[PDB]
Design a protein around this ligand. Structure first.
Ligand SMILES: NC(=O)c1ccc[n+]([C@@H]2O[C@H](COP(=O)([O-])OP(=O)(O)OC[C@H]3O[C@@H](n4cnc5c(N)ncnc54)[C@H](OP(=O)(O)O)[C@@H]3O)[C@@H](O)[C@H]2O)c1
Ligand SMILES: NC(=O)c1ccc[n+]([C@@H]2O[C@H](COP(=O)([O-])OP(=O)(O)OC[C@H]3O[C@@H](n4cnc5c(N)ncnc54)[C@H](OP(=O)(O)O)[C@@H]3O)[C@@H](O)[C@H]2O)c1
Ligand SMILES: CC[C@@H]1C[C@@H]2C[C@@H]3[C@H]4C/C=C\C(=O)NCCC[C@@H]5NC(=O)/C(=C(O)/C=C/[C@@H]4C[C@H](O)[C@H]3[C@@H]2[C@H]1C)C5=O
Ligand SMILES: CC[C@@H]1C[C@@H]2C[C@@H]3[C@H]4C/C=C\C(=O)NCCC[C@@H]5NC(=O)/C(=C(O)/C=C/[C@@H]4C[C@H](O)[C@H]3[C@@H]2[C@H]1C)C5=O
Lengths: 354, 354
């Protein structure tokens, strides 16, 4: 009847808007019972992801509980019917915890806005990873974010040569992957970034035009920047921002256009709940708008196609998937903070190697 | 060579909001030159359509111009290179005029909000019509509105047995037609209507619930009636109204739900331009939203299809395509006004026999 010392980051306090990592999260020591049920496993956390969607996960986490997050774990011990053996690497929602016990089965997010179901843990096979595509990429381009970009661009958006594609929130991993895929499919690609460096970075990834969303702060100034960046209209919009940039894009939708709603940062994070009605603007364009919830694509078939298609382009150097690996379980909230407010210096997926 | 006296309804004044049809329009005598260019035809108007979408056509029509509308016409006289011969019957955007000279070719709506192109005149064939499917159906179930409903239900929405289908604006020919096709695919069809007498007309047509949209002023009041009317949520939504009813339906979208946007009466007519941001409610449901602009389906193949699929069911009494034909050219604007003020007595498509 043993037990082990583990550390955990827990939700101290609920604060909406831009969260203040130093204030919401407290690092505690915790005794973990190492006694396993017949198909439970004891796991060690090797990497964790920090993502903006955690802001609204946290505001749904009971005070005192650990911060959920996507992670890479190694099995230390396992009961006789556990899905994985000791040594196996898994990707799943381990959280900001050094170690944990779980059977890796799918689990409801009880206190979520929706009845969301966190996926079963995914076995990672080392043959898929090398120095060009390290194991850590199971939290980025070979993970949720990659699956979001690749799934949208191959199961919904049909970018054609000549199209103008708008990507809001382009500086992040998903945005840059969508842009680079769109460019490969032959499109003019316009993005929004948040400073001259980031906008230059997107220009080095192949974006044809980059608009500063800090300068163009309202839909009118934003309408101006789009009309200059996209003079023939918008065929495809990959939206992570919402708000007044999305209001702007909807005024200039072309016929048969397609909008993918991946996130609404300006609503979720900036509490912008009311705005110009958008549906009156989509009838003549005959525009199709599809909500994106990439969990529906987490199948073994899609993960292989991901590693074939997307892993290939990354390895042949036809496609840049950049990540930023902060070291140290104790710097997890400092890494998370650098997503909001400190996006300067931040390229791609931010991970923490523990 | 020669001329003939005609009457025309012209736009004398622009009035926003709900139309004042007696203040907007003026009936004039107009001498038409009847000397025909080589592809021009002289046509005589048999029926005209009055529709809510005419409110926007009007506001885009220069003062003094004639009011455009959908009509059934008959070729009196035709140049040698005309597309049709005298005696031929055609459906086209002839307008509130007793006679006109046109060449039947597609025409750009110069002054539109959108660069829309009115279609070429479409020859009708009297063989195709009997007492069950009168010639006037070329302005209803065998015309515009019929092609809007049928096209949506066979080209976009995949209604499957067990769905809950919600139709805002259900009393008219389009909502009525959607519901009946949805019911034939196994759905539970919920609607809205404005009376008790139409509420009972829809139910008797096979609707399982009918909210009264006048009782339901609010997005709150509308959620409650919907929750009741559709307890398992919405999988399909045919929207003609927008506004607060649409804000309600978007709060209870099921997974893989489809929304088709037909009109936004609440914004177009009632001038409600702001509301809750709706896009942030579609991501988890993976809702698909498609603007409708049925002009895209006006193809020869699609008409023959519409005749055969619907003309069967309508004729065999399995599909109710009622119509309300007002008599008298001098009454066209009064018939148009009832769509907005006195619909309690209308049934299906409103036309005017000239
Ligand atoms: N529905 C789904 O299935 C799904 C799946 C995965 C992810 N998501 C969500 O979708 C988003 C996209 O992923 P990502 O990796 O591309 O995220 P991300 O870009 O890392 O999010 C932060 C970035 O967005 C930019 N940004 C911040 N505030 C902005 C604003 N108000 N207007 C415009 N841009 C702004 C910043 O660019 P600068 O650095 O240039 O300031 C920053 O680098 C994430 O927020 C994630 O939570 C949804
Ligand atoms: N996008 C396209 O391609 C396309 C093509 C054709 C038509 N449309 C539009 O689609 C709509 C449907 O066509 P239709 O022929 O069936 O017209 P309709 O529904 O007969 O239009 C007027 C009717 O709508 C109802 N109504 C008025 N205000 C309402 C409200 N606030 N909420 C709910 N219902 C309300 C009234 O019904 P009660 O008598 O029950 O009050 C009235 O009978 C029209 O708006 C039409 O212009 C679009
Ligand atoms: C173990 C795999 C992990 C599980 C994580 C759960 C993550 C998903 C859920 C994360 C947060 C959430 O659901 N917050 C409350 C709603 C706010 C807001 N409204 C939405 O509709 C929405 C999303 O729809 C997000 C989708 C994320 C997509 C992302 O890809 C998933 C992560 C995935 C990589 C929002 O954020
Ligand atoms: C000759 C065949 C005729 C040609 C007519 C032209 C009619 C179409 C045009 C009618 C009005 C219009 O274009 N008004 C300006 C936009 C306001 C508002 N925004 C929209 O996107 C919209 C429509 O999307 C309308 C679609 C109608 C659909 C209708 O069915 C067509 C008529 C059709 C039956 C709106 O109403």
């Amino acid at each position: 009847l043993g037990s082990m010392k583990t550390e955990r980051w827990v939700v101290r306090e609920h604060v909406e808007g831009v969260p203040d990592a130093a204030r919401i999260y407290e690092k505690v020591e915790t005794e973990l019972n190492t006694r396993l049920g017949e198909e439970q496993m004891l796991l060690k956390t090797l990497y964790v992801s920090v993502d903006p969607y955690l802001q609204g996960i946290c505001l749904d986490t009971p005070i005192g509980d650990h911060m959920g997050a996507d992670s890479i774990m190694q099995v230390l011990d396992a009961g006789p019917n556990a899905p994985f053996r000791p040594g196996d690497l898994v990707q799943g929602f381990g959280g900001w915890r050094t170690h944990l016990v779980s059977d890796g089965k799918p689990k409801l997010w009880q206190t979520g806005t929706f009845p969301m179901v966190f996926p079963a843990y995914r076995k990672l096979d080392l043959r898929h990873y090398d120095d060009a595509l390290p194991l850590s990429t199971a939290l980025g381009v070979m993970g949720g974010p990659g699956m979001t970009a690749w799934g949208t661009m191959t199961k919904f958006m049909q970018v054609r040569p000549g199209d103008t594609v708008v990507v809001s929130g382009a500086s992040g991993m998903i945005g840059t992957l969508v842009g680079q895929m769109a460019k490969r499919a032959g499109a003019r690609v316009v993005g929004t970034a948040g400073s001259a460096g980031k906008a230059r970075y997107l220009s080095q990834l192949g974006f044809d035009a980059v608009i500063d969303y800090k300068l163009a702060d309202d839909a009118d100034k934003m309408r101006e920047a789009l009309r200059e960046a996209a003079p023939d209209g918008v065929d495809k919009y990959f939206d992570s921002i919402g708000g007044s940039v999305t209001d702007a894009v909807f005024s200039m939708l072309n016929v048969g256009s397609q909008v993918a709603v991946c996130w609404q940062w300006a609503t979720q994070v900036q509490r912008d709940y009311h705005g110009p009605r958008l549906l009156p603007y989509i009838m003549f364009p005959r525009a199709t708008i599809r909500g994106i919830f990439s969990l529906e694509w987490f199948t073994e078939q899609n993960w292989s196609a991901l590693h074939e298609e997307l892993g290939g382009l990354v390895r042949r150097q036809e496609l840049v998937a950049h990540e930023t690996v902060q070291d140290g379980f104790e710097h997890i909230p400092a890494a998370y903070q650098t997503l909001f407010s400190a996006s300067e210096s931040n390229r791609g997926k931010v991970l923490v190697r523990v």
